[PDB]
């Protein structure tokens, strides 16, 4: 929709392979590390790799790892929708 | 200089007078003024007298409270059992109307009424509060470091428990009394089951001395294993148990510890420079001389 033909997120994992931030995983009740860009577990239904903006340092390594897929938009903001 | 009526129950004046002497001196050195209570008696000791008759327990504790009420002052205490009696009867009779009535018509035979106008404080509680002398003020007043001494704290039971009836917070692992010992410069150590009863409460000290001494010996074993060089305490009951009971343990059992037992006021006096003779450390069953060699 935004115009990137090559696609969005396919869940490859390169972004979290290169992210340098490491934070606790709330799915694992904090026992396990997860990067700033992450999925809870490998069986999440939308396999889309959220970015944790409270902990991201905007280093930009994730976008270079994502490459032509261009799925990462580090400047995204809270959008509001009204549904009847 | 805050002023408090000094209740001074039975054991501190009549067995360990250095405790009360150091109480007055150290409290005056920090900003506290301890005034004698005029004709106070035994706070009806909560175990040995509450076990017999709760109504006379109420009446005697209320008489002790109305002495300081006429003095128009706040009670200050140095005993956990006296705290139980005085503070808890004050709290109960500030809220229970039929008990107020009963105690008042008992006290009317001696021209004396309870109205519930004052508050009861433990001296260590005052030393810990920030409005009154705080931990920093205690550190300021300390003039002899007392460094290089391992000191084990015994909280007792009647000061902090039950926590649904007091306001000192956690009873499972409090650290406030450990901060007062750390202010003096002595390092407080932690031992197994540090919140265990000493065994002297409830009249067990008198009824079954062997049972009480076994409860005490469990503590003494844990404290020696930790490696303490003295046991600080905030109760003359607990001090009497830990002091006499070491001798009775040495005779009834075959266990030797020789661990000095000192009230926190006695340690505060030692920190502030009072002499061992002026503290009457010769009146304890267990010699304090090794601890004095270490901290002096």
């Amino acid at each position: 929709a935004k115009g990137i033909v090559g696609g969005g997120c396919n869940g490859c994992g390169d972004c979290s392979a290169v992210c340098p931030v490491i934070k606790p995983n709330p799915f694992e009740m904090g026992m396990a590390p997860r990067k700033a860009i992450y999925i809870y577990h490998a069986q999440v239904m939308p396999l889309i790799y959220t970015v944790d903006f409270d902990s991201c340092v905007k280093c930009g390594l994730c976008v270079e790892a994502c490459g032509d897929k261009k799925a990462i938009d580090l400047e995204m903001q809270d959008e509001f929708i009204t549904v009847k | 200089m805050h002023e408090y009526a000094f209740f001074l129950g039975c054991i501190a004046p009549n067995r360990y007078p250095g405790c009360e002497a150091s109480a007055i001196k150290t409290s005056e050195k920090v900003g506290i003024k301890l005034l004698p209570l005029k004709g106070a008696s035994c706070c009806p000791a909560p175990g040995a007298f509450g076990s017999i008759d709760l109504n006379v327990w109420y009446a005697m504790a209320a008489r002790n409270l109305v002495l300081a009420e006429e003095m128009k002052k706040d009670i200050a205490l140095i005993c956990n059992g006296c705290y139980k009696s005085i503070w808890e009867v004050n709290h109960i009779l500030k809220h229970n109307d039929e008990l107020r009535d009963n105690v008042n018509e008992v006290l009317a035979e001696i021209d004396m009424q309870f109205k519930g106008t004052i508050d009861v404080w433990h001296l260590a509680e005052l030393y810990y509060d920030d409005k009154v002398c705080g931990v920093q003020k205690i550190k300021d007043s300390v003039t002899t470091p007392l460094s290089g001494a391992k000191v084990a704290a015994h909280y007792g039971c009647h000061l902090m428990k039950p926590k649904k009836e007091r306001h000192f917070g956690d009873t499972e692992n409090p650290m406030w009394f450990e901060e007062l010992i750390g202010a003096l410069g002595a390092e407080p150590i932690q031992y197994r089951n540090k919140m265990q009863c000493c065994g002297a409460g409830g009249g067990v000290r008198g009824y079954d001395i062997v049972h009480a001494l076994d409860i005490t010996n469990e503590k003494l074993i844990n404290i020696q294993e930790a490696g303490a060089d003295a046991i600080t305490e905030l109760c003359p009951f607990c001090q009497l148990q830990f002091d006499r009971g070491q001798i009775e343990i040495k005779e009834k059992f075959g266990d030797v510890y020789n661990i000095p037992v000192l009230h926190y006021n006695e340690l505060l006096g030692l920190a502030q420079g009072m002499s061992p003779q002026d503290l009457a450390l010769d009146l304890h069953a267990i010699d304090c001389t090794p601890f004095l060699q270490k901290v002096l």
Binding site: - | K29, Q136, K137, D140, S141
Partner: protein, 79 residues
């Protein structure tokens, strides 16, 4: 914006914590004085810190280094 605590019990009124503070020395000893507020003033023989809300100190340690019988503790951690 730190917090200084003066042990009133051993303060002698020497006034070498008032004279040596470089924020006190701003009023009379600066060209075109910027701020004329003072951390300490010795009232009744002991040093009183007027800087109640911890806005003017700069953790210099000139006052801790000045008191002859150490009595000023400087706190470098948020109050």
């Amino acid at each position: 914006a730190f917090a200084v605590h003066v042990n009133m019990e051993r303060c002698t009124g020497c006034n070498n914590c008032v004279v040596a503070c470089p924020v006190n020395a701003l009023e009379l000893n600066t060209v075109n004085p910027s701020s004329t507020d003072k951390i300490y003033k010795v009232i009744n023989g002991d040093a009183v810190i007027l800087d109640v809300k911890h806005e003017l100190c700069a953790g210099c340690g000139i006052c801790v280094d000045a008191c002859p019988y150490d009595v000023i503790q400087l706190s470098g951690q948020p109050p």
